[PDB]
Amino acid sequence: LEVLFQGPLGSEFMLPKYAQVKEEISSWINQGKILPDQKIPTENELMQQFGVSRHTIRKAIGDLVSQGLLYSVQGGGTFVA
Amino acid sequence: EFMLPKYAQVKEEISSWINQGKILPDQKIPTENELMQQFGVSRHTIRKAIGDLVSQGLLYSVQGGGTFVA
DNA sequence: AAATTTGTCCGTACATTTTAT
DNA sequence: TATAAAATGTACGGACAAATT
Ligand SMILES: [Ca+2]
Numbered sequence: 001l002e003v004l005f006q007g008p009l010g011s012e013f014m015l016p017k018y019a020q021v022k023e024e025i026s027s028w029i030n031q032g033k034i035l036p037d038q039k040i041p042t043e044n045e046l047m048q049q050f051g052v053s054r055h056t057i058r059k060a061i062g063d064l065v066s067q068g069l070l071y072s073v074q075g076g077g078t079f080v081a
Numbered sequence: 082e083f084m085l086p087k088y089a090q091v092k093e094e095i096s097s098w099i100n101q102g103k104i105l106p107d108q109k110i111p112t113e114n115e116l117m118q119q120f121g122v123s124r125h126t127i128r129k130a131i132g133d134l135v136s137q138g139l140l141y142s143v144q145g146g147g148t149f150v151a
Numbered sequence: 152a153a154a155t156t157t158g159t160c161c162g163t164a165c166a167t168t169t170t171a172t
Numbered sequence: 173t174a175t176a177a178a179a180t181g182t183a184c185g186g187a188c189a190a191a192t193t
Contacts, residue, residue, distance in 0.1 A: 009190080016159060042179060053161045058180090066136045074180045075168030086182060112156060123184050128157090144157045145191030 002050050017052050021060035024050070029069055029080050039077045040070070087122050091130035094120075099139060099150050109147040110140070 002024055007014040015023070028034045041049065046057045061078060064070045072078045085093070098104055111119070116127045131148055134140045142148045 018159075044179080055161060056159085059159085072180065073169075075170075075178075077169085077179065088182075114156080125184060126182085129182085131157095142157065143192075145155075145193075147156070147192090 004051065017050075018056050018059040018063070021046070021050055021052065021056060022063055025060065025064060026069060034080045036080050039079050042077065087120075088126050088129040088133070091116070091120055091122065091126060092133055095130065095134060096139060104150050106150050109149050112147065 004017055004020050005014065006017075025040065028040070034040055040046075043054055043057050043061075046061075047054055050057070061070060061072070065072060065078075069081055070078055071081050095110065098110070104110060110116075113124055113127050113131070116131075117124055120127070131140060131142070135142060135148075138151055140148055141151050
């Protein structure tokens, strides 16, 4: 289970949920907790572990894919690039 | 096939508008609601199309302002 | 100040592709 | 070899929030 700082907005520190998810996943990649061509957790698992909607998870992941950090295979999973 | 998902057809048409110079840089494209009406699709589909085009650098958005050709 | 417009977040349903039985 | 289950993709709907007009 990973935590969301969840501070509304206006203070300098707050990020939308999808951005906090992106940061955590990017962090796994950067710290080498996941290696290229290895599968990250499924969308359902990420939903449970982060406590957010499938939409939010897909937004984070989609951003990361368009960044080049990840790639997805329909029906297979999502992997570090 | 010839088939493309709806968000991709929307992307093609907006890109087409920009490529043919029908809208110049820093000019505003139609609103999300006008696009939903014109294409006959959901706000979600429109936002997917636009978001893809923003991420590839063809467009930029301003919350409360509109979406513009880059 | 009100209305408009984009941003975030959530829910459902079904299709498509891969993976497990 | 064939079926089911699992996992991602598309599409849709709603409610509020934030920023501009
Ligand atoms: Ca406005």
